[PDB]
Design a protein around this nucleic acid. Structure first.
Ligand SMILES: Nc1nc2c(ncn2[C@@H]2O[C@H](COP(=O)(O)OP(=O)(O)O)[C@@H](OP(=O)(O)OP(=O)(O)O)[C@H]2O)c(=O)[nH]1
Ligand SMILES: [Mg+2]
Ligand SMILES: [Mg+2]
Ligand code: NA
Ligand SMILES: [Zn+2]
Ligand SMILES: [Zn+2]
Lengths: 1330, 73, 50, 49, 149
DNA sequence: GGGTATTCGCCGTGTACCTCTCCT
RNA sequence: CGGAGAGGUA
DNA sequence: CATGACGGCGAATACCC
């Protein structure tokens, strides 16, 4: 029916064409009757009959009469629904300015006219005059005349020119400006201009003028001569107790506009004095812009209560606006909700639906089935049978829902798995029964949680529920690929208890024919569940061709493990159960089952595991009592010793031996050590128990204490909670965050005193309020991510790109943060992966790395793998399946049509609430490797480092690096390159308080261009008395010293200068202030010594990274490589002009500089320290560098909290951040040089130009924040529905934008099939038919 | 078919295409009066279509061939 | 009368519900004796003593 | 509230994730049966007709 | 003191006793904490919370279902729910959420008739809320319209 | 007259659900 | 049945 | 009248040449 949405300015003729009549009266309805007044806001001849086919006077009341316009009342007989489609118009007595095109920054009228917004406000609101077409007088065409000077100019010369005020003057100025010639004037003035600020300001106007020129919009249309009126059925009057009506908050503004328009009309024909007429014009203007955007300028016009009136702009913007409240989401039919209870008997694909809810939800299906078998002749008969709830009605309801899935949802829906499909089972009662294993996916529990249920009506929806959303098809997390249905709590406890072993349990030493005999013995009480026995076990292993070869052997196991073996499907080894099965062990068992056997056996196995866990947790009788919280008997003496220690420290402080701060630090350390000792004693006493062996001998075994079993199994609790229960609560923090000196020595079993409890309330309140105020920030970040990634869909199988990102294991130095396996699992290689033979190809160019491929890579000691990424994908309008890689939830390569952007946004957003707002030493055996390092002579023979950026790698024999360290300048290694290290020795040392200028060759240092007393000064510290020299800072020095810069040359006994071989410049070093010359003149400086001394994370961090926010003190980098030339130094801010054509740069002087005046740094080198701005990373080191930076920085935050998110989601977000490009050279393309456009547009244009053989345009990739990227998208519909609806719609209307319904949000709003998933092919069929 | 669609997915190759083909077949059986190619073990048209797909009896090409034969005879 | 899950006690660290439970048992025990003394129609002195 | 004889043990999943298992004797003794009083208003007004 | 009171009542001092499974009579393997806890019934009864709607009354401006159990309203399928549907690729389920279950007046009538007829097929149309948005933007003096087919 | 540090006004700030009173 | 205010549940 | 929010960002302002 339509392919696009067109938006532009509305001409008065267009507004009249929309309208069906003019509203002239300010009254809505006569409230004595219920009839609407003639020519009012609810008038019937204009908008339509109130009743269906009933004209207002009531003559014509029939369908036959339809189409006849009644000549008595004037109302056309027709559907009453036309009252919500037919618009009115108000003929304004005077022109009025539209507030959106005036106040919404940038002012479109102001920019289009170059008169400041202040002057437009004063003139429109009747505080000044503007001269229009002055002519031969000195007055210009945009000069402001004050009320006091207007008549003065009139008397001086008041006839040849024209001057006006109000909206009429602004409309005249807008209508008397020629667009094209003024564009030409501005475009030429853009050339003959010397100010780069001026060229930006002119190009802004040029871009606005081109908008008005390329579209059919006329500037004068921004002044409203005709005001459209919304249809009355869209602004109804809600009856309150029948008699009285509430304030509509929209009809009131219309009434004020009509009142002021009528007053202005009745004064216009009256020819009243100009002062009151101008005042009425001004008041009509504020009435109009209050109707459009109430409160945008000035005081918010107020209703009966102090609450501001809700304007037309408020209708379409905000959380309660049309877009977010009625288009991007809406209330639905065939839906219900109820409290959830646990269904432990349910299968994974089943849910427990109350039969009353099912009867209501499936009601039309029941009616259809009643008609089918003849039990109900009519609709009313079926309705009565359903209301009476007859037995046959219940049988029909059972028939209908047998395989009709329903959707269960729990708010907040943080990820797609927050809505899942289940087969309903009719249950009594009123609560929905939920399968336990899906609770983790829902973040659901049974302490009051409620869930919504929805009925997929159509066959397509039912099959989507079954194949896409059913819980049995969604057992893997899309964020990281890990299973979601791992047993928790009592199931884990049951499996752990039944798989535990007891030293002297009943039935020990028995030899059993198999699991069946073990179950028989346990159920008959002849053998304990933990008895160590020998059992004949037949296990199955897949062969090369996939058949299950059976091997039978005698296993040393327990009775419970043998019993649990019966539910293990064939193909899994017996070792997976021959252990005490905790939470991680059960999860690993489910992982093994999924890897070996597939999805359906995994679901069956998970259900069987949950049944067994419930049953044996019940049989165990696991409880919790006060005695289970065993407090160590050494706790009291540990506390006494800590108190004595802190008392000794306090006595030392009272004797002045220690100060207050170090006293506090020492006491805190002592109490922390005491807490550690108490925790260790408690855990040691709690984790082990004594038991009589087979013989009368004591033996130690893992304790069967209930709390310890729950914690060790992983069902519930942890070390911190156990030590809070039975150890001590520990050190607490004050509200400002400082640690309280005295910790809580009591535990929860002993009970706290008033003081300790009040102290703990500080942290409790802090945590609860932190959660309450962080959930909103997490939701906002999730929404921004969803918008920035909403339209990204897998649209291709393979784009054929060769580029990719280089994946290495994440190592911060001294630990393996993240292995290579998890960073390449499910990825597609971008190039060939070789064997250590360097010739044999381990992995070809287009392999999808599954588990076996990763096993091969780690077995052949692979260091780095180049993999394809969505950031480097060549696909336009989406990405290819190969660059994205494996679908984490499904476990195979991503299918075409998947909305990976929304998946990535949810994957990142969901754990948001879990987020909380000297010398190097190698610690392991391995060879040493240095890169970007040079070998020089040394005084002691151990190499110094000279390069600005130096890093050290420890390669552990086989060829894989394990640790990586950063070596600052002037750091002398304690060993050499390529030397094996036992582990635990200081590899390199450096003084952090001293920055040397070390010279490679020895000789006497000569003070060249050095003046004593001006640029260098002598002190003698009393402790030493040495004549130490200090270089005065380039600004802190004297006036005479400011002219001369410090310089130290290298001379030797021979007299000449020995310099760095290979160069043409003599070796000269400069020490620009804050430098300590400790040695005297003419002293042999051996290499390897110092010459001068120079001193020296949570959810908001993730949001800042995704918004591409600039750091407060960004690290300065080199725009172009070359030798640095500091032409300007100090002078408020040192200006460094590098030289490869040299380019100047402006740098603050108070910033530290790693570079020296004679250093040849490369492009992207760290000139100064500080957090790196991602924009600079993209500009200088490329797209891959900024992608890696964002990925690493986000994953640091998420790993700190133990959250596992695949990097590909962050890469999707980065790719959405990198959609814009600025044209550097126009070439033969149509793009204006220096403008920002879509990178895909530039790719297509360059591709077609190169196909024609012409030269393509050059571009610079732009990194935009997710909010900025979302607001800069081509579709104005999506941007308007996101944020800043007024500004976005104003931009679209002025530019005459056209929106092709290409994205997910756009098609959701217009209620079409989204171009993703099952609808994707439909859109393809829509595209290929044009 | 019922609990999981892995066999049907691997027959079709694309899960969304599987949903579309199953919907077409289920509409044929529910509204078009067509008969199941598998025994009707008290299943719904959607599940019957999925069972037919996972056994290779029904796919997009087979449905197109049968449609052309039906309209040309 | 009601079966509560022990596993909601350790991580919640609301140990009072356990102690109250113990104390509740003790309380009921006292009543269980007094009720018995009331059912056997024991001497008022015996109830006084207990 | 009411004094309930409580046992701390898992019971076949019916107390999973803070769920509560309640004996039918509690229902029979009306231990937690509660009285709710609802006020319905019928207003005869003066219509135009 | 609690253990002393337990002794006075001839009860175990640990507060744990031997329990038997009513279903089978089998003794539970470990002692179970059994006592008396004072329990409250909160004013969050499932009677007041359970609610379901197939069809019902609709709003005036938007033709979407009303809100609230008291008004027999439908559940709100909000933005994050739509995001979940998009992430599943369930385009038809999302479309029926947007149109035949909400403000598509003609679509919902046809859907109800088809369900009664046993034809589980939808013929979605333009939601009325989009038309309301278009009229509202037009009332702001902005010409917004749909293009040709 | 022109470049740049400071200022001012606007934009945004979680979902779903439940109860009550009061409102030209 | 729209809005406002207040409180509450997850 | 309300005077308990604040961070980010772009247009406008002022200050310093
Ligand atoms: N989640 C879960 N499912 C179980 C379990 N045990 C059996 N099932 C599966 O449930 C499905 C329904 O069982 P049926 O026995 O066919 O029941 P029916 O009479 O209602 O048709 C069967 O799969 P099917 O219909 O043959 O499915 P498919 O193989 O076509 O996917 C069966 O394999 C369990 O413990 N957990
Ligand atoms: Mg909860
Ligand atoms: Mg079956
Ligand atoms: Na099967
Ligand atoms: Zn008439
Ligand atoms: Zn690609």
């Amino acid at each position: 029916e339509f392919d696009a949405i067109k938006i532009a300015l509305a001409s008065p003729d267009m507004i009249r064409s929309w309208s069906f009549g003019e509203v002239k009266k300010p009254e809505t309805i006569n409230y004595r009757t219920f009839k609407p007044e003639r020519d009012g806001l609810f008038c019937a001849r204009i908008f339509g009959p109130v009743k269906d086919y009933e004209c207002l006077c009531g003559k014509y009341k029939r369908l036959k009469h339809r189409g006849v316009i009644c000549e008595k009342c004037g109302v056309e007989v027709t559907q009453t629904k036309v009252r919500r489609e037919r618009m009115g118009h108000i003929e304004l007595a005077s022109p009025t300015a539209h507030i959106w095109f005036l106040k919404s920054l940038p002012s479109r009228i102001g920019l289009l006219l170059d008169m400041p917004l202040r002057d437009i406000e004063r003139v429109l609101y009747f505080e000044s005059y503007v001269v229009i077409e002055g002519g031969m007088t000195n007055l210009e065409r945009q000069q402001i005349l004050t009320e006091e000077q207007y008549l003065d100019a009139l008397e001086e010369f008041g006839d040849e020119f024209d001057a006006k005020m109000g909206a009429e003057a602004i409309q005249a100025l807008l209508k008397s400006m020629d667009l094209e010639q003024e564009c030409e004037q501005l475009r030429e003035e853009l050339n003959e201009t010397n100010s780069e600020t001026k060229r930006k300001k002119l190009t802004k106007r040029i871009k606005l003028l081109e908008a008005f020129v390329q579209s059919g919009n006329k500037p004068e249309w921004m002044i409203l001569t005709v005001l459209p009126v919304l249809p009355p059925d869209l602004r109804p009057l809600v009856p309150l107790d029948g008699g009285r009506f509430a304030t509509s908050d929209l009809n009131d503004l219309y009434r004020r506009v009509i009142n002021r328009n009528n007053r202005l009309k009745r004064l216009l024909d009256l020819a009243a004095p100009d002062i009151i007429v101008r005042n009425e014009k001004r008041m009509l203007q504020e009435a109009v812009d209050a109707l459009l955007d109430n409160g945008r300028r000035g005081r918010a016009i107020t209703g009966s209560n102090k609450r501001p009136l809700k304007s037309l702009a408020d209708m379409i913007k905000g959380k309660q606006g049309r877009f977010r409240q009625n288009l991007l989401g809406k209330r639905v039919d065939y839906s219900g909700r109820s409290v959830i209870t646990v269904g432990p008997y349910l299968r994974l694909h089943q849910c427990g639906l109350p039969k009353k809810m099912a009867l209501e939800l499936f009601k039309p299906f029941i009616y259809g089935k009643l008609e089918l078998r003849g039990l109900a002749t009519t609709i009313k008969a079926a309705k009565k049978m359903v209301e009476r709830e007859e037995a046959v009605v219940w049988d029909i309801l059972d028939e209908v829902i047998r395989e009709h899935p329903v959707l269960l949802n729990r708010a907040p829906t943080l990820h797609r798995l927050g809505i899942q499909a289940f087969e309903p089972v009719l249950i009594e009662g009123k609560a929905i029964q939920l399968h336990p294993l899906v609770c983790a996916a829902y973040n659901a529990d049974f302490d009051g949680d409620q869930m919504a249920v929805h009925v997929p009506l159509t066959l397509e929806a039912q099959l989507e529920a079954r194949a896409l959303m059913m819980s049995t098809n969604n057992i893997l997390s899309p964020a990281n690929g890990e299973p979601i249905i791992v047993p928790s709590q009592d199931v884990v406890l049951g499996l752990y208890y039944m798989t535990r072993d007891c030293v002297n349990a009943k039935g020990e030493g028995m030899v059993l024919t198999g699991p069946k005999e073990a179950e028989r013995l346990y159920r008959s009480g002849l053998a304990s569940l933990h008895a160590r026995v020998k059992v004949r076990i037949t296990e199955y292993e897949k062969d090369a061709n996939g058949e299950l070869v059976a091997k039978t052997s005698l296993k040393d196991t327990t009775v419970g493990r043998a019993i649990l073996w019966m539910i293990v499907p064939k193909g899994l080894p017996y070792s997976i159960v021959n252990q005490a099965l905790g939470k991680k062990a059960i999860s690993k068992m489910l992982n093994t089952c999924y890897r070996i056997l597939g999805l359906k056996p995994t679901v069956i196995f998970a259900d069987q595991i949950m049944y067994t866990g419930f049953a044996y947790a019940a049989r165990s009788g696991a409880s919790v009592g006060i005695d289970d919280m065993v407090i160590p008997e050494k706790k009291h003496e540990i506390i006494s010793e800590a108190e004595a220690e802190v008392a000794e420290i306090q006595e030392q402080f009272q004797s002045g031996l220690v100060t207050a701060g170090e006293r506090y630090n020492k006491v805190i350390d002592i109490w922390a050590a005491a807490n550690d000792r108490v925790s260790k004693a408690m855990m040691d006493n709690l984790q082990t128990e004594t038991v009589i062996n087979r013989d009368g001998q004591e033996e130690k075994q893992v304790s069967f204490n209930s709390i310890y079993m729950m914690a060790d199994s992983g069902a519930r609790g942890s070390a911190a909670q156990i030590r809070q229960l039975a150890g001590m609560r520990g050190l607490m923090a004050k509200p400002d965050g400082s640690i309280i000196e005295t910790p809580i020595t009591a535990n929860f079993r002993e009970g706290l005193n008033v003081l300790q409890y009040f102290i703990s309330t500080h942290g409790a309140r802090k945590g609860l309020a932190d959660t309450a105020l962080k959930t909103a920030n997490s939701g906002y970040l999730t929404r921004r991510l969803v918008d920035v990634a909403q339209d990204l869909v897998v649209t291709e199988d393979d784009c054929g790109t060769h580029e990719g990102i280089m994946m290495t294991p994440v190592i911060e130095g001294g630990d393996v943060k993240e292995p290579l396996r998890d960073r390449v699992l499910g990825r597609v290689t971008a190039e060939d992966v070789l064997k250590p033979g360097t010739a044999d190809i381990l992995v070809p160019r287009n392999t999808l790395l599954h588990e076996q491929w990763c096993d091969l890579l780690e077995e052949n000691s692979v260091d780095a793998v180049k993999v394809r990424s969505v950031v480097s994908c060549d696909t336009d309008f989406g990405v290819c399946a190969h660059c994205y890689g494996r679908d984490l939830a499904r476990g195979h390569i991503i299918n075409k049509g998947e909305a990976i952007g929304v998946i990535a946004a949810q994957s990142i957003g969901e754990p948001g609430t879990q987020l909380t707002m000297s010398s190097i030493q190698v610690k392991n055996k391995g060879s040493i490797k240095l890169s970007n390092v040079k070998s020089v002579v040394n005084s002691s023979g151990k190499l110094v480092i000279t390069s600005r950026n130096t890093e050290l790698k420890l390669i552990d024999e086989f060829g894989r690096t394990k640790e990586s360290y950063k070596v600052p300048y002037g750091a002398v290694l304690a060993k050499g390159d390529g030397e094996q290290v036992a582990g635990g020795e200081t590899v390199a040392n450096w003084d952090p308080h001293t920055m040397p200028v070390i010279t490679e060759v020895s000789g006497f240092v000569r003070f060249t261009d050095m003046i004593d007393g001006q640029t260098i000064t002598r002190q003698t510290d009393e402790l030493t008395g040495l004549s130490s020299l200090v270089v005065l800072d380039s600004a802190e020095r004297t006036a005479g010293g400011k002219d001369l810069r410090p310089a130290l040359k290298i001379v030797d006994a021979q007299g000449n200068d020995v310099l760095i071989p290979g160069t043409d410049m003599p070796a000269q070093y400069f020490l620009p202030g804050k430098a300590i010359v400790q040695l005297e003149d003419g002293v042999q400086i051996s290499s390897g010594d110092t010459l001068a001394r120079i001193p020296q994370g949570g959810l908001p961090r993730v949001a800042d990274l995704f918004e591409a926010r600039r750091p407060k003190e960004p690290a300065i980098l080199a725009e172009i490589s070359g030798i640095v030339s500091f032409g300007k130094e100090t002078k408020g801010k040192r200006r460094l002009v590098i030289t490869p054509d040299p380019y100047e740069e402006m740098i603050p002087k108070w910033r530290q500089l790693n570079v020296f005046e004679g250093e040849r740094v490369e492009r992207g080198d760290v000139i100064s320290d500080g957090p790196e701005a991602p924009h600079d990373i993209l500009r200088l080191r490329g797209v891959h560098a900024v992608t890696r930076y964002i990925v690493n920085e986000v994953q640091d935050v998420y790993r700190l909290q133990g959250v596992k998110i695949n990097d590909k989601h962050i890469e999707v977000i980065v790719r959405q951040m990198l959609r814009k490009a600025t044209i550097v050279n126009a070439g033969s393309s149509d793009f204006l040089e220096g403008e920002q456009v879509e990178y895909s547009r530039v790719k297509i244009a360059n591709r077609e130009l190169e196909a024609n053989g012409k030269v393509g345009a050059t571009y610079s990739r732009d990194l935009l924040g997710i909010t900025k990227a979302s607001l800069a998208t081509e579709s104005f519909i999506s941007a308007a529905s996101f944020q800043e609806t007024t500004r976005v719609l104003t931009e679209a209307a002025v530019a005459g934008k056209r929106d092709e319904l290409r994205g997910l949000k756009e098609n959701v709003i217009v209620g079409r099939l989204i171009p993703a998933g099952t609808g994707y092919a439909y859109h393809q069929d829509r595209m290929r038919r044009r | 078919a019922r609990v999981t669609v892995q066999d049907a997915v691997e027959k079709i190759g694309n899960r969304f295409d599987l949903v579309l083909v199953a919907a077409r077949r289920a509409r044929q059986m529910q509204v078009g009066g067509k008969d199941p190619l598998v025994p009707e073990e008290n299943d719904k048209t959607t599940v019957i279509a999925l069972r037919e797909i996972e056994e290779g009896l029904i796919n997009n090409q087979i449905l197109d061939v049968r449609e052309r034969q039906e309209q040309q005879e | 009368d009601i079966v509560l899950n022990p596993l909601g006690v350790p991580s919640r660290m609301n140990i009072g519900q356990i102690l109250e439970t113990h104390l509740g048992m003790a309380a009921k025990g006292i009543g269980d004796k007094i009720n018995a003394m009331l059912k056997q129609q024991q001497e008022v002195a015996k109830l006084r003593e207990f | 509230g009411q004094n309930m004889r409580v046992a701390f043990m898992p019971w076949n999943g019916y107390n999973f994730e803070d769920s509560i298992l309640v004996s039918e004797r509690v229902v029979q003794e009306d231990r937690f049966t509660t009285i709710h009083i609802q006020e319905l208003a019928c207003v005869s007004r003066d219509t135009k007709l | 003191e609690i253990k002393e009171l337990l002794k006075l009542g001839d009860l175990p001092t640990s507060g744990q006793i031997r329990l038997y499974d009513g279903r089978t009579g089998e003794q539970f393997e470990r002692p179970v904490t059994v006592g008396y806890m004072y329990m409250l019934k909160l004013n969050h009864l499932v009677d007041d919370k359970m609610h379901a709607r197939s069809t019902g009354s609709y709003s005036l401006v938007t033709q979407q279902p009303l809100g609230g159990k008291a008004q027999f309203g439908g559940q709100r399928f909000g933005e994050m729910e739509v995001w979940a549907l998009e992430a599943y690729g369930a385009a038809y389920t999302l479309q029926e959420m947007l149109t035949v279950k909400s403000d598509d007046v003609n679509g919902r009538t046809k859907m109800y008739k088809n369900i009664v007829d046993g034809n589980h097929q939808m013929e979605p149309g333009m939601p009325e809320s989009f038309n309301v948005l278009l009229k509202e933007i037009r009332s702001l003096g902005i010409n917004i319209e749909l293009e040709d087919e």
